[PDB]
Amino acid sequence: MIISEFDRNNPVLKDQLSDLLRLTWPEEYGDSSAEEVEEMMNPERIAVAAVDQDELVGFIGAIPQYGITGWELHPLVVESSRRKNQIGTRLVNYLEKEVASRGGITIYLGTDDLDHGTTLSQTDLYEHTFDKVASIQNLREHPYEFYEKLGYKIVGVLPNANGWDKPDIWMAKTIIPRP
Amino acid sequence: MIISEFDRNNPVLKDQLSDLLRLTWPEEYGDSSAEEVEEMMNPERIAVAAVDQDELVGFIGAIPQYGITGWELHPLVVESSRRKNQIGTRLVNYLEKEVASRGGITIYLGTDDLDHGTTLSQTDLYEHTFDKVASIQNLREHPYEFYEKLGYKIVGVLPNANGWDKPDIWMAKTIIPRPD
Numbered sequence: 001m002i003i004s005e006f007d008r009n010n011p012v013l014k015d016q017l018s019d020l021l022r023l024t025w026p027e028e029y030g031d032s033s034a035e036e037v038e039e040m041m042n043p044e045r046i047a048v049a050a051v052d053q054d055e056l057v058g059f060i061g062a063i064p065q066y067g068i069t070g071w072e073l074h075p076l077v078v079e080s081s082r083r084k085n086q087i088g089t090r091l092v093n094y095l096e097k098e099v100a101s102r103g104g105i106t107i108y109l110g111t112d113d114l115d116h117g118t119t120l121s122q123t124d125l126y127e128h129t130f131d132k133v134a135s136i137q138n139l140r141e142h143p144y145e146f147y148e149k150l151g152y153k154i155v156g157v158l159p160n161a162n163g164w165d166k167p168d169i170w171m172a173k174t175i176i177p178r179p
Numbered sequence: 180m181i182i183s184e185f186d187r188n189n190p191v192l193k194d195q196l197s198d199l200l201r202l203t204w205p206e207e208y209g210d211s212s213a214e215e216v217e218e219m220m221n222p223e224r225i226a227v228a229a230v231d232q233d234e235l236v237g238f239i240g241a242i243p244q245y246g247i248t249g250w251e252l253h254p255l256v257v258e259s260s261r262r263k264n265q266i267g268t269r270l271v272n273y274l275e276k277e278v279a280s281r282g283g284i285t286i287y288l289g290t291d292d293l294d295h296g297t298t299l300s301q302t303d304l305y306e307h308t309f310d311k312v313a314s315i316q317n318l319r320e321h322p323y324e325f326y327e328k329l330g331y332k333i334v335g336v337l338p339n340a341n342g343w344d345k346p347d348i349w350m351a352k353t354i355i356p357r358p359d
C-alpha cells in the first residue's frame with residue numbers, strides 16, 4: 001500500500017489521525033485531542049502511516065523509553081472498515097525494522113482492558129496473578145491476541161490501572177537475534 | 180524533620196533537588212536536571228519533599244498515567260547519607276495518602292536492574308518468565324526489595340529494556356480497600 005514515514009507537517013493528515021483517535025478511544029482523546037497528536041510528532045518518536053491515495057487508514061508510533069534500546073509501541077490504530085486486512089501487521093512489521101535500525105532491542109506496549117474483553121478483567125488480579133495471566137482467554141476480540149500472533153508475549157499486568165478490575169496488559173518482544 | 184508538599188515556589192529547594200538527582204543519576208540527570216525538576220513541578224504530577232531544618236533530604240514524585248486511577252511513582256530519592264533511616268518509607272506513605280485523596284487507586288513503578296542486582300537480570304526472561312519473577316532473589320541490595328517491604332508487588336518485567344539482560348522491573352500496589 002503506501003505505508004511510510006508520517007508527514008508531521010501535514011495539518012490534514014494530523015486532523016485525520018486526531019479523528020481516528022477520537023473515534024477509537026473517545027474516553028482518552030477529547031477536545032484537546034490535537035495536543036495528543038502533537039506529542040506523537042516529537043522528534044524522538046517514530047511516526048508511520050498507511051495512507052490510501054489521501055485517506056489515512058492506519059497509524060503506528062513508537063516512543064524510545066529506555067535509552068534507544070527499549071521502545072514503547074504507542075499508539076496503533078486502523079480505520080474500522082479496513083481491519084482484518086493485514087494493515088496492522090504491516091504497520092507493526094514496518095515499525096520493528098525501523099526501531100531495530102535505530103538501536104532498539106525490545107518493543108513493549110500496554111493494551112488496556114476496560115471492556116471486560118479478556119479474563120484478566122473483572123477479577124482481583126492480586127489473587128493468583130500469574131495463574132490468571134497464563135490462563136488468559138479472549139472474550140471480545142481484545143487486541144492482545146493480535147500482538148501474540150505477531151510474536152509479542154504478555155510479560156506483565158497492572159492491576160486496577162483504569163479503575164477496579166480494569167487492568168493494563170504489558171506485552172513485549174525482542175526484535176533482533178541475540179548476538 | 181517533616182514530610183509535606185514540595186513548595187515549588189522555592190528556588191533553593193528546586194536547586195537542592197536538581198543536585199540530589201545529579202548526584203544519584205548523573206547519566207539520567209544533568210543537562211535537563213535543572214529542567215526535569217520542573218517537569219516534576221507540573222501541577223498534574225505530585226511532588227513531595229522530606230525536609231530537615233531546611234535541607235531537602237528526600238523527594239518523591241508521581242505522574243497520573245491512567246485517568247485518575249493509576250499513578251506512576253517517579254522519582255524516589257533519599258540523600259545517600261540519610262538512607263536506611265526510614266525517610267523513603269515515610270515518603271511513600273505520604274505519596275499514597277496524596278494519591279488516594281485525588282481519587283487514585285493504584286501506584287506502580289519501574290525499577291531497573293542494570294548491574295545484576297537481582298536474579299531477573301542475566302537470564303532469558305521470555306523463558307519461565309513468571310516462575311523467575313516469583314522466585315526473585317536480591318543479590319546486591321537492589322531497591323525492588325525496598326518496595327516489596329512497603330507492600331508493592333512485582334507484577335511484570337520488560338526483557339532487555341536497557342540492553343541485553345538488563346530489564347526494567349514493574350511493581351504495583353493498590354492503595355485503598357478493595358470494594359466488597
Ligand SMILES: CC(C)(COP(=O)(O)OP(=O)(O)OC[C@H]1O[C@@H](n2cnc3c(N)ncnc32)[C@H](O)[C@@H]1OP(=O)(O)O)[C@@H](O)C(=O)NCCC(=O)NCCS
Nearest residue numbers: 076077078083084085086087088089111141142143145146
Ligand atoms: C488491533 C488492530 C490494530 C489490528 O489491525 P488489523 O489490520 O485489523 O489486524 P491484521 O489484519 O494485521 O491481523 C493479523 C492477525 O491477527 C488477528 N487479529 C486482529 N485483530 C484482532 C483482535 N482484535 N482480536 C483477535 N485477533 C485479532 C487477525 O485475525 C489475524 O490473524 P491470522 O493471522 O490468524 O489470520 C486493529 O483491529 C485496530 O485498529 N483496532 C482498534 C484499536 C486497537 O485496539 N488498537 C490496538 C492498540 S493496543
Ligand SMILES: CC(C)(COP(=O)(O)OP(=O)(O)OC[C@H]1O[C@@H](n2cnc3c(N)ncnc32)[C@H](O)[C@@H]1OP(=O)(O)O)[C@@H](O)C(=O)NCCC(=O)NCCS
Nearest residue numbers: 255256257262263264265266267268290320321322324325
Ligand atoms: C531505595 C531508597 C529510596 C529507600 O529509602 P530508605 O529511606 O533508605 O529506605 P528505608 O529506610 O525506608 O527502608 C525501609 C525498609 O526497606 C529496606 N531497604 C531499603 N533499601 C533497600 C535496598 N536497596 N535493598 C533491600 N532492602 C532495602 C530497609 O532495610 C528497611 O527494611 P527493614 O525494616 O527490614 O530494615 C534509597 O535507598 C535510595 O534513595 N536509593 C537510591 C535511589 C533508588 O534506587 N531509588 C529507587 C527508584 S527505582
